[PDB]
DNA sequence: CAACGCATGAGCTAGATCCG
DNA sequence: CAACGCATGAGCTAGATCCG
């Protein structure tokens, strides 16, 4: 047969040889097989155990710290292929730290599909270089066989096989002293082969029985089906673990085996593209009965069935299993017995839930002030209830002042009863507002929710405050609200002014952050103003808020304050929040202006947008200046050592970009470049200080050398005068003419003429000239460098 | 008289001219006089007002933004002297941002005692450079007169007195166009002077009526006594405000006017060294009846008389008023309605208080931990009681678990009643421990302190856990305690292991209150162990801690944990804390290894102690080696362009002397503790140094002989230094003829090696003088003898 | 009679209807 | 019968009486 034996799950053996007994009849082992850490095991109980029918291994084989095995060929006589479907530690087969292993014995391996082999730290193995991994392993660039007994060539290495020449040597490759590694002709690479060199059927591997038959060889390639195997089996069956395909009656049971959540090593198996896969991936969720996966229009829930029907969340890690879960099929109870700060972390841990079916009880909650962490709650089913048929439960909580923001939120409880007892910091109108947004209207117990033990310790307020005049500047805003008095004008402590900046308008109401936590509202208090006994008076109390960064939206509100006493009045008043943006001003400086010179007439300049914009900037303002050369360099004797080598004002309104090039300018000239960032213009044209950079453009190739009639005059004392013309536009400035004269047979002897020496003389001279035929050649060396040479002018003075 | 008028406290005037009316009869203004910020004042309201009797100013005179004045002489006709006892803004007289001041008018100013004058931003002033400030003030370097109308020389400067020559010019010095600055002869400096040059009595200043009399000049120097003034008045009187002295009957009344604490401009005046001073300073405290000041052995209390009998404490700022008080003369109430973290700041703010006279009330305490911030409480008097005659009050505090550690604390309560209601986390036995340390034993009200609303929500524990075996490594510590089971061994959640390091043993205990702490006991939890139904089994549970630093004392304890139920049993158990130090290991590397070379032989070397000592380091271990010469210099033509040790103990620096001169040396050093068991020495750090040349070993002595060849090329033969400083690289070889200078030549290392000497090609025949100097790589040396040889023509 | 002038704007002297 | 050996010591394989 192909695989006549039994399927067999991946196992693990430790500290005994007892649980190796369950490999009696299984032939293919999906998963992996790790046997590790046996210590009190003699070498004698291995010479009678064997497993003759074992062939297929999917993931890896790992033998690690075994004491008593000397040759594992007596345990694995017939395994041929390792699929390598899961890598272990970036390896596929690892034998490690064997203490009594004489020889390996893996003489029947044919094709490692994926991965590499690793053998370390074994002072008892030989024949390790007689394997020819290159004929089994497709990738030998990951092999790692170091620190063994064959670190020194000392163990014999004799064996009775082709003795292949894969390297430059006639290396003989044997497994044991009784077996060589089998190599037949390479006319078919991995197609399976015989002892007589006949290649077997194209779709199988390894050991073979009859050639060119897909029904009686051993280990085939892609899949397997009932004694046959084709590369893509037809879809009465769907592929499974990339080595089989099977009818959907089979693997629909395994989905129902661990729908009973008893082992989390399984997967809720789904059908997708004829692959009974663990999970159809992101952008896909499963349907109920057909076991397919649905293209998941928008976000699809990833339902999260709760364990044991209920749960209590008390810290971070109890809720950290709940991250990503959206629909919960049970009941939840929150209880933060103290705690420092959860008000920042529940949104990243549980702030994406929408659906629960049981009941939500809060109790003993110390540092919770709102329920704004429940961002996406819309419906509670209430299928299971608390005793007395209760669905929402609140008891003995000391800081709860808000439940939700009912202006922008929706919540419905289908059945059950709400509960609110001994919750002294939440006013009675809120749970009345909670009653109207929910489904229940008259479902009360009598006694229902406690009307006296809730909100008694907290003065909930019923009056509003409006502003009167708001004023802007670039730095300071101004507030002045309408006056107020309590019904006793003596009992008044003043007001508090809460403010913070706001980039958006999804800003919370005063959530009452009183425990530990993040950024609260920064606040200053106000001395209560003077009584005047007049209706028209200066009773409007003002305050200046000063230290504000400009061009930023800022939110404000003001709250009353009163002492606590026996009378249940003078509740105070509370303003509503608004939004006020400050004005803008002069902006910041530009950043990093970069000048690059490519040609003599192109000069590109790029900068970076400014650090502080202070409003939408309209454009940029640029200015340049044509620099001047140094006038003190004109009077230097340049044949003394030291020669130099360098490297309104018009404008444009550059808009909507980041760089600009300027053309039409002088060659090899320095330029001081300054540019201003500047906001809106036709009212209050106001710009920053310019960033200043320097720039010199490229020189021109012919501006250095001069052409002209080089005429000469011979005097009576053999001092020949020389007249020529200067460069009209030098690259910066001419500094020295390399005047040189050459007699035939004599070298190019050079002289000097300075800038002022050429200026005073209008040429040069040559004193003490020997009579002959000389050739005078000049090079005009400017400050940008040397020019070209002139024509070597011929003149002959005779004896 | 000397000062006939009246004393006058320092006033401030703003927004009007009405409150100058109270200066009608006073003559000396102690303090300062600031008149500032009037706007709705015409320039014509001043010409009918003056103050003819003003003489002395103690601190400063400040005129700032006055609209309507034009000349100060209309108001201050007799203003003479400024004492400058307090400097405003580091100046003594400031006339600033005046708008209509044409000319100054202050002409009688004689002596500024301390400070300088500042006139700024007045573009209507003239004659400002006609003052001669050096003959009024004693310091002129700190003067600052800038940006006036005299920024340009434009206002005339015409004036009818010496026109002195203090600078290089004949500058005229005068105040107005009608008066000039008066300077008499300098035979006496500031001793008072007449118009006729007669110097007055030695102890006064300024204007004067009759000379050489201490009774009828005007402004005198040190003090003042009844028309006379002597430089130190006898102690029937005590000096006051450094310008007067007076009997003790005077300033004992101002001490009693101040004890009616109606203004914080007080100074509780005490007598000290005949000076009725504001405060006798630190190291001194006043006595009650005698009004002197006592030398204050130890810290003396600086008593803190609390206002309106009581006070509330809720934040960082209400307690910041009472920093540095020890005794409080009233009752105190605290109420911490939440907050974030206030445990770490109370000892910095109020941890030095000792005594309370009234009563102490705690209500609505939310986020407290203990009362250990009250470090030095020992007694509460209870001179005021609460309603129902109550002295201690704790009510509705939802977290409190520990009052004090009574083993290291003493506290008493004289009278009153204690109150403990609705404090559900504090054990009932702690108040019984509070009852026995207090003064009261059986003064109960019935109903007294609540025995039911306190301790119900928190099971205070009554059983202890002992340890069984501790083991230490250099990095890990192993812990194992005796087993424990509740009376129901199903109800058990495990244990908690709190630990933190501690350099001392004054460690806070666990209390079990939430206050939002930066440092805390870091904790891991333990799975509860297996039940085995055997007394002798492996029921001792263990845990290993690993992430520690070596050689550090560490404190540990373990607490039980159980579910909350309705039966009032299974409270749990709590171990007692102990201390366990880790072991020591191989230490770190020493730091900052610096070696300096001062001579050719001495090498001083200095380092630092290591960053990680890991125990008491016993000694050090040094190793030096003889660095070899760089042999790559052997081929450069320079005519072109075991190891000895010592166990150094108990010091930080070491010198290595008595060794071979001019050799480079690589030296290393190790730091390590004890040796003969567990030989533990650390890694080494390496230095390098280079030394100085010698005097005579670089120079070679020897017969510089010459061999004469026939081609006028005389050979030269001498010897090389057998021990130079390192390596001889160039012999400064030279030859000198009569009338010629010492003409030099050069020779490399190989050239003297290949030839064994030198030559001189194409030599003029004469009596030459051949002298060689040895110039090694470290510098030059001495010359040899200039050798004479006379080749003939 | 509804910003600017007869100050500056958070560096021991007031604190933006604070002033008319 | 009271540290070492027949591992390492917090880098998908156990977690310091974890194995005797």
Author numbering:
A (entry chain E): 1 to 160, 169 to 655, 756 to 907
B (entry chain F): 1 to 160, 169 to 649, 756 to 907
Which lines from the publication concern this structure?
The insulin receptor (IR) is a member of the receptor tyrosine kinase (RTK) family and a key regulator of metabolic homeostasis. IR autophosphorylation on intracellular tyrosine residues stimulates two major signaling pathways: the AKT pathway initiated from insulin receptor substrate 1 (IRS1) and the mitogen-activated protein kinase (MAPK) pathway initiated from SHC-transforming protein 1 (SHC1).
IR-A62 (A62) is an aptamer agonist for IR that preferentially induces m-pY1150 in the kinase domain and selectively stimulates the AKT pathway and glucose uptake. The overall structure of the complex forms an arrowhead shape; the head consists of L1, CR, and L2 domains, and part of the FnIII-1 domain from both protomers, and the stalks are comprised of the two parallel FnIII-2 and FnIII-3 domains. The dimeric interface is formed by FnIII-1 and L2′ domains without extensive contacts. Compared with apo-IR, the structure of the entire protomer in the IR2xA62 complex is not changed significantly. Rigid body rotation of both protomers of apo-IR by 26.7° with respect to Cys524 (FnIII-1) resulted in the formation of the arrowhead IR conformation. A62 binding on the L1 surface competitively blocks αCT′ binding to L1, resulting in the displacement of αCT′ from L1, which is disordered in the structure. By contrast, Tyr and Trp substitutions of Arg702 and Thr704 (R702Y/T704W) in αCT′ that augmented the interaction between L1 and αCT′ significantly inhibited A62 activity. These results suggest that the arrowhead conformation of IR induced by the displacement of αCT’ from the L1 domain is a key step in m-pY1150 formation and for selective activation of the metabolic response. By contrast, the structural states of FnIII-stalks in both IR2xA62 and IRA62+Ins are heterogeneous, and classified into three and two different states, respectively, in which the distances between FnIII-3 ends vary from 34 to 45 Å. Our study suggests that the arrowhead-shaped IR2xA62 is a plausible candidate in which insulin binding can occur by simultaneously engaging with site-1 and site-2′.
